[PDB]
Amino acid sequence: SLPGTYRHVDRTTGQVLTCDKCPAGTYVSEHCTNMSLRVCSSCPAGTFTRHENGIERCHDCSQPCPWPMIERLPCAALTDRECICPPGMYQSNGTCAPHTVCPVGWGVRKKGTENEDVRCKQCARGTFSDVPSSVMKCKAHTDCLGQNLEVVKPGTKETDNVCGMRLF
């Protein structure tokens, strides 16, 4: 039972044996017997074992990455291949979906990842987004006074302050 062991019933003698586990990257090619320790063999190409184990066959690797996913992790003796969505997309259902574009009047509020869509928010008062973008955040209105000009047209969610000079 103890966690480095597994239980195995000798297929001829019927005896209940306590065998030692094999390392990850390996599987049991020969169970222990009355006289002998279990024998381990390396996972063949296209299979893997992630953990210490007492199993008779390595796990088949996942299918190769379906377009447009890319492989960050190859199939190897200790690892399943790992497929992820290319930049600017995220895992949706079983495929890749483009990141949500935050339109004019909106800016990124939570950045987009390979597992999670972009989250957008309405630019707050005093800021604006004049571009649809899945990465740009909201930008503060140009300070017109700060460069010795007047606000000739107040900014909105969608538009910057318009600076200018006026005569009277």
Binding site: G4, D20, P23, A24, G25, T26, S36, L37, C40, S42, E52, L78, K110
Partner: protein, 202 residues
Amino acid sequence: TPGDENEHAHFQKAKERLEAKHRERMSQVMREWEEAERQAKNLPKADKKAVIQHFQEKVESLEQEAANERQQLVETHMARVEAMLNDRRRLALENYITALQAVPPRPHHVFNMLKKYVRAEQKDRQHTLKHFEHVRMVDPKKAAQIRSQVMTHLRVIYERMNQSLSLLYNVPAVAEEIQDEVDELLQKEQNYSDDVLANMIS
């Protein structure tokens, strides 16, 4: 709340780092174990057995290092969330008190601020409980050890709340104005606190 989602995101990112680190260490040990059994394959049975014992000791050691490091991450996250909540509690309290020193007092307002300050104190308490619960799960002996400390903190939350109420009892017109909305707030609060002590003893 953006602070909520953000703190959980930093905690999440820390966990992922930590697991990547553990996975690499484990992987290196498993490769070495396999190569060692390969080297020892023509030795006596007892010597092969010693190879296995050796590497199951390395593995056990790594696994406990990793468990330890995970608890450290949890502790760091809990502390941070506590700081966030302490802040919000202090803000609600100040707003309620300026609502209570406002002249003329508007009991609409006062009871609303009172509302949110009670909610803050509650969420503080909830966090305290959740921390203790986690400790109890992963480590009942430590939890048994720090219980006393938690109870005394809970008693602090009570006292602070009570004083906060007393302030309302200072300005009687407002108090009588909103007394039964206050009484129902304290109703469900009493229920919450009770729920918490229940979740505490087991």
